Design a protein around this ligand. Structure first.
Ligand SMILES: CCc1cc2ccc(CN3CCN(c4ccc(C(=O)NC)nc4)CC3)cc2[nH]c1=O
Length: 350
């Protein structure tokens, strides 16, 4: 029987739940009879990305629906979807491509989680929670509710929930301090870079075994760059609710997970509209998508030398931007050092 704290055991059970992984695949209309969890492979997902790149190439060149049918059909051949005996929906536009690129990104984290469960050893005498905990290669500790870092974290959640995301409110259940093995060593060239901020990153519960195991990752080279607003990087927010929307929680599953990561932003390349970049301009270390609203710059505080933008939302003074709130993107996985993992309860008001 496991000696790990009860909040840590509940976290492990939640992230390694096979029925939740199957639920996420049904949500994507994937045919689990033709392609179950065990037959999902990096090779097949990578080939599907390549077909999405071929589709996006035809859409950008104004191909007719009849011309694009063969390309669209090719994607469904690689990633079988459950449409019975009907024709699947045609992928003939940028939005369709982006939705499928986003699904494949999630499939990559789910495959990692399922591969951890299948690729080890079987020992009945050990508690499965302890066995699964060791597969993450991440030290997970419970942060004390009355500590200084907990109070700062709770303030960041309390102050940065946007008014436009008022369909739910958030309650912090557990705060975990996380240390992925080798990540601090990887982060060394960036540990003293200017503009290091503690930013949010939300994701579905089914991604967290992959995130703790492999870290935050960038979409593979096979993925279409146009499927991502600011190209293929790792995306963060300074407003808790902007990241909490990426948990995809609901009334029927109101518990979500969100990361706090130290991100070395350095010289930010400030943008107001989509830019499907492959590389940053010389001397730039990240992209900052300028939002209309920003956490009050005067209320920024420091947590272990890292700036925490926990001020309440005010006008940034930025006009003509497609973003309501800020977003930060890095294009090198080494620029991220995950610090905390929060378990949140979403209370829906709808
Ligand atoms: C603006 C704040 C924000 C943006 C945001 C944007 C997107 C996603 C969804 N994630 C993207 C990364 N993704 C990947 C998973 C695996 C791999 C891989 O194996 N690469 C080789 N690459 C990417 C999983 C799904 C979550 C987000 N959460 C936020 O809080």
């Amino acid at each position: 029987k496991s000696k790990l704290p009860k909040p840590v055991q509940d976290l492990i059970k939640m992230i390694f739940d096979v029925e939740s992984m199957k639920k996420a695949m049904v949500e994507y209309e994937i045919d689990l009879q033709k392609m179950p969890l065990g037959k999902l492979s990096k090779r097949q997902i990578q080939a599907a990305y390549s077909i999405l790149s071929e589709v996006q190439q035809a859409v950008s060149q104004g191909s007719s629906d009849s011309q694009i049918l063969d390309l669209s059909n090719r994607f469904y051949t690689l990633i079988p979807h459950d449409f019975g005996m009907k024709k699947p929906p045609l992928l003939n536009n940028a939005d369709s491509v982006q939705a499928k690129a986003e699904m494949l990104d999630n499939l990559l984290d789910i495959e990692v989680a399922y591969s951890l469960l299948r690729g080890g050893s079987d020992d009945s005498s050990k508690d499965p929670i302890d066995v699964n905990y060791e597969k993450l290669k991440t030290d997970i500790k419970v942060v004390d509710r009355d500590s200084e870092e907990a109070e700062i974290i709770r303030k960041y959640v309390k102050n940065t929930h946007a008014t436009t995301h008022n369909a739910y409110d958030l309650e912090v259940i557990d705060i975990f301090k996380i240390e992925r093995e080798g990540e601090c060593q990887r982060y060394k060239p960036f540990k003293q870079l200017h503009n290091r901020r503690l930013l949010w990153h939300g994701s579905r519960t089914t991604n967290f075994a992959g995130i703790l195991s492999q870290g935050l990752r960038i979409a593979p080279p096979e993925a279409p760059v146009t499927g991502y607003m600011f190209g293929k990087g790792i995306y963060f927010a300074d407003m808790v609710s902007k990241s909490a929307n990426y948990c995809h929680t609901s009334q029927g599953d109101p518990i979500g997970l969100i990361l706090l990561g130290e991100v070395a932003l350095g010289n930010m390349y400030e943008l107001k509209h989509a830019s499907h970049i492959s590389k940053l301009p010389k001397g730039k270390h990240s992209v900052k998508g300028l939002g209309k609203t920003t956490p009050d710059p005067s209320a920024n505080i420091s947590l272990d030398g890292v700036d925490v933008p926990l001020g309440t939302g005010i006008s940034s003074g930025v006009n003509d931007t497609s973003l309501l709130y800020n977003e930060y993107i890095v294009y090198d996985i080494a620029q991220v050092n995950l610090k905390y993992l929060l378990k949140l309860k979403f209370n829906f008001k709808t």
